[PDB]
Amino acid sequence: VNNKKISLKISEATILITKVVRILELSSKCQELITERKFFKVLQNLDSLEKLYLQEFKNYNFQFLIEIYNSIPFLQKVTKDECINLIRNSLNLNLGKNLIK
Amino acid sequence: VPPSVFNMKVILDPFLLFTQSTSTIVPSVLTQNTISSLTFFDDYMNKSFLPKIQMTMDYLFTVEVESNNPYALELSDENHNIFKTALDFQRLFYNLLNVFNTANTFREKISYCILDLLNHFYNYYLGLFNSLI
Amino acid sequence: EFFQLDDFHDSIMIFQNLNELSVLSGEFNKEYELRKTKLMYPLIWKKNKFTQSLSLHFLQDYFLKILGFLLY
Amino acid sequence: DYGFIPPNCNGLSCLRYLPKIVEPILKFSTELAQLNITTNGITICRNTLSTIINRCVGAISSTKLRDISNFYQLENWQVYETVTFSSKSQDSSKNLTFEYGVTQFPEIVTSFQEVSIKTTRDLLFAYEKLPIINGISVVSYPSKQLLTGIEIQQIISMEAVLEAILKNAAKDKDNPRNSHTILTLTNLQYFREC
Amino acid sequence: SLYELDPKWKKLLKTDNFLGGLTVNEFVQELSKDHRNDVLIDANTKNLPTNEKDQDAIREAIWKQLDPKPYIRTFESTLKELKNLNEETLNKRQY
Amino acid sequence: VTNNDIFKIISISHNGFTSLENYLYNIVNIDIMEHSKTINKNLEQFIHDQSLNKQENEGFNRIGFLLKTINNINKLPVAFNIITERAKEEIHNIIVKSTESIRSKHPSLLKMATSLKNDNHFGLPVQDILSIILRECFWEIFLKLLYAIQCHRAIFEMSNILQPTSSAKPAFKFNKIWGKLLDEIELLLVRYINDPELISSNNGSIKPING
Amino acid sequence: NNTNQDKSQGCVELSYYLKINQLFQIISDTGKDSEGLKSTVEPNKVNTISGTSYLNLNCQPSSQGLTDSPTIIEMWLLILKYINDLWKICDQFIEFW
Amino acid sequence: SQEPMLDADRLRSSWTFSESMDLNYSNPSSSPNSLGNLKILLDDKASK
Amino acid sequence: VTQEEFSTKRLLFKFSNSNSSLYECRDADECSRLLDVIRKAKDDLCDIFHVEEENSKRIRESFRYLQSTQQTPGRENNRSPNKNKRRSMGGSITPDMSSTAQRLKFLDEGVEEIDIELARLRFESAVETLLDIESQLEDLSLMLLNLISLKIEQRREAISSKLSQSI
Residue B28 DSSP class: T
List, in sequence order, every residue forming a beta bridge with I21; answer none if it has no partner.
I14
F7: distance to nearest CA of chain H, Å? 18
The CA distance from I1 to I41, in Å, is 11
Residue pair F124/B93 in contact by the 8 Å Cβ criterion:
no
* Sign, CA torsion A81/A83/A85/A91: negative
Q: Does F191 touch chain B (CB under 8 A)?
A: yes
Q: Do H39 and G12 touch (CB under 8 A)?
A: no
D181: distance to nearest CA of chain G, Å? 19
Residue pair I129/I104 in contact by the 8 Å Cβ criterion:
no
Which stretches of chain I sit within 8 Å of chain C by CB?
115-116, 119-121
Among the listed residues I78, D3, I141, the one whose alpha carbon sits nearest the alpha carbon of residue G25: I78
The 10 Å Cβ neighbour count of residue F111 is 16
Q: Do I52 and A7 touch (CB under 8 A)?
A: no
Q: Does B61 touch chain F (CB under 8 A)?
A: no
I29: distance to nearest CA of chain A, Å? 25
Half-sphere exposure of I98 (CA within 13 A, CB side): 10
Residue pair F119/B116 in contact by the 8 Å Cβ criterion:
no
Q: Does C60 touch chain A (CB under 8 A)?
A: no
CA angle B4, B9, B13 (to 5 degrees): 115
The CA distance from D15 to D6, in Å, is 13
Q: Which of I76, I80, I86, I87 to substitute to test the interface with F, most F CBs within 10 Å?
A: I76
Q: Do D3 and G71 touch (CB under 8 A)?
A: yes
Residue pair H20/B109 in contact by the 8 Å Cβ criterion:
yes
Q: Do G62 and I80 touch (CB under 8 A)?
A: no
CA angle I132, I135, I138 (to 5 degrees): 145
CB burial readout C20-42, b (16+ within 10 A) else e = ebbeebeeeeeeeeeebbeeebe
The 10 Å Cβ neighbour count of residue H21 is 24
Q: Do G2 and B101 touch (CB under 8 A)?
A: yes
Contacting residues for F125 by C-beta, under 8 A, at least 6 apart: F111, F131, I84
I and F touch with 3+ CB pairs <8 Å, answer: yes
Q: Which residue of C has its CA nearest to A83?
A: C21
Helix, strand or coil, per DSSP, at residue A29: helix
Helix, strand or coil, per DSSP, at residue C65: helix
Q: Does G84 touch chain F (CB under 8 A)?
A: yes
Experimental method: cryo-EM
Q: Does B33 touch chain F (CB under 8 A)?
A: no
Minimum-distance CB partner of I112 among A7, A44, A52: A44
Q: Do I46 and E24 touch (CB under 8 A)?
A: yes
The CA distance from F60 to F49, in Å, is 13
Q: Do A57 and I93 touch (CB under 8 A)?
A: yes
Instruction: Please give the single-letter amino acid code of residue D186.
Output: T
CB burial readout A64-89, b (16+ within 10 A) else e = bbbbbbbebbeebbbebbbebbbebb
In sequence order, what DSSP letters do the residues of H2-36 get, joined into one string? ---S---SSSTTS----STTT----SSS-----TT
Q: Do A92 and C6 touch (CB under 8 A)?
A: yes
The CA distance from E49 to E58, in Å, is 11
Distance between terminal CA atoms of chain C? 12
Q: Do H15 and B99 touch (CB under 8 A)?
A: no
Residues of C in contact with A93 (CB under 8 A): 25, 28-29, 32
Q: What are phi and psi of B51, to 5 degrees?
A: -65, -30
Q: What are phi and psi of I13, to 5 degrees?
A: -120, 85
Contacting residues for B4 by C-beta, under 8 A, at least 6 apart: F195
Q: What are phi and psi of I87, to 5 degrees?
A: -70, 100
Residue pair D57/D80 in contact by the 8 Å Cβ criterion:
no
Q: After which residues is chain A broken (C to N over 2.5 A)?
A: none
Q: Which of D84, D85, D113 to substitute to test the interface with G, most G CBs within 10 Å?
A: D113
The CA distance from G1 to I51, in Å, is 58
Residues of H in contact with G58 (CB under 8 A): none
Residue pair E86/E78 in contact by the 8 Å Cβ criterion:
no
Q: What are phi and psi of D45, to 5 degrees?
A: -70, -35
Burial class (CB in 10 A: 0-12, 13-18, 19+), D68: buried
Burial class (CB in 10 A: 0-12, 13-18, 19+), F211: exposed
Which stretches of chain B sit within 8 Å of chain G by CB?
100-101, 103
**I140 vs E37, I98, I106, I134, I135, CA distance in Å?**
49, 11, 15, 10, 9
Q: Does C8 touch chain I (CB under 8 A)?
A: yes
Please give the torsion angle defined by the CA atoms of residues D121, F26, F11 and G54, in that order, rounded to the nearest 10 degrees: 50
Please give the sequence-ordered ranges of beta strands (E in DSSP) within chain I, or none if there are none.
none
To the nearest 10 degrees (0 to 180), the angle between helices F180-192 and F170-177 is 20
Contacting residues for I82 by C-beta, under 8 A, at least 6 apart: H11
Among the listed residues D133, D102, D117, the one whose alpha carbon sits nearest the alpha carbon of residue D35: D133
Burial class (CB in 10 A: 0-12, 13-18, 19+), B52: buried
I111: distance to nearest CA of chain H, Å? 22
Contacting residues for E75 by C-beta, under 8 A, at least 6 apart: A23, E5
Q: Do D83 and G39 touch (CB under 8 A)?
A: yes
**I93 vs A53, A57, G12, G71, I64, CA distance in Å?**
12, 9, 47, 44, 9
The CA distance from D98 to D84, in Å, is 5
H or E element: which one contains D104?
helix D104-109
H32: distance to nearest CA of chain B, Å? 14
Residues of E in contact with A80 (CB under 8 A): 47, 56-57, 60
Residue pair B114/H1 in contact by the 8 Å Cβ criterion:
no
Residue pair D36/D134 in contact by the 8 Å Cβ criterion:
yes
Q: Do F12 and G61 touch (CB under 8 A)?
A: no
The CA distance from F158 to H29, in Å, is 31
Which chains share 3+ C-beta pairs under 8 angstroms with C?
A, I
Please give the sequence-ordered ranges of beta strands (E in DSSP) within F20-129, or none if there are none.
none
Among the listed residues E60, D158, F66, A7, the one whose alpha carbon sits nearest the alpha carbon of residue I47: A7
Residue I13 DSSP class: B
Cis amide prior to A97 (ω within 30 degrees):
yes
Helix, strand or coil, per DSSP, at residue I14: strand
The CA distance from E82 to E70, in Å, is 17
The 10 Å Cβ neighbour count of residue F81 is 11
Q: Which residue of E has its CA nearest to I36?
A: E24
The CA distance from E83 to E60, in Å, is 32
The 10 Å Cβ neighbour count of residue F63 is 14
Residues of E in contact with A16 (CB under 8 A): 78, 81, 84-85, 88
Contacting residues for F8 by C-beta, under 8 A, at least 6 apart: F19, F20, F22, F23, F132, F135, F136
**B102 vs B105, D166, H24, H41, CA distance in Å?**
5, 35, 10, 10
Please give the torsion angle defined by the CA atoms of residues D130, D135, D139 and D145, in that order, rounded to the nearest 10 degrees: -160
H or E element: which one contains I134?
helix I123-139
Among the listed residues F184, I15, G39, the one whose alpha carbon sits nearest the alpha carbon of residue D83: G39
CA I81 to chain centre: 22
Q: Do F30 and H21 touch (CB under 8 A)?
A: no
Q: Do F21 and G73 touch (CB under 8 A)?
A: no
F141: distance to nearest CA of chain B, Å? 9
Minimum-distance CB partner of A100 among C9, C28, C69: C69
Burial class (CB in 10 A: 0-12, 13-18, 19+), C50: exposed
Among the listed residues F119, F127, F89, F122, the one whose alpha carbon sits nearest the alpha carbon of residue F198: F122
The 10 Å Cβ neighbour count of residue E50 is 8
* Sign, CA torsion G84/G86/G90/G93: positive
Residue pair E38/I54 in contact by the 8 Å Cβ criterion:
no
Residue I2 DSSP class: B
Q: Which of I80, I138, I159 to substitute to test the interface with G, most G CBs within 10 Å?
A: I80
H and A touch with 3+ CB pairs <8 Å, answer: no
The CA distance from E28 to E36, in Å, is 10
Residues of I in contact with H12 (CB under 8 A): 81
The CA distance from B1 to F151, in Å, is 40
Residues of I in contact with A52 (CB under 8 A): 91-92
The 10 Å Cβ neighbour count of residue D109 is 22
Resolution for this experimental structure (Å): 15.0
CA G61 to chain centre: 9
Q: Which of G81, G83, G85, G88 to substitute to test the interface with F, most F CBs within 10 Å?
A: G81
Residue pair B110/B99 in contact by the 8 Å Cβ criterion:
yes
Which parts of B1-133 fold into alpha helices (H)? 21-24, 49-61, 82-97, 109-128
Q: Do A41 and I109 touch (CB under 8 A)?
A: yes
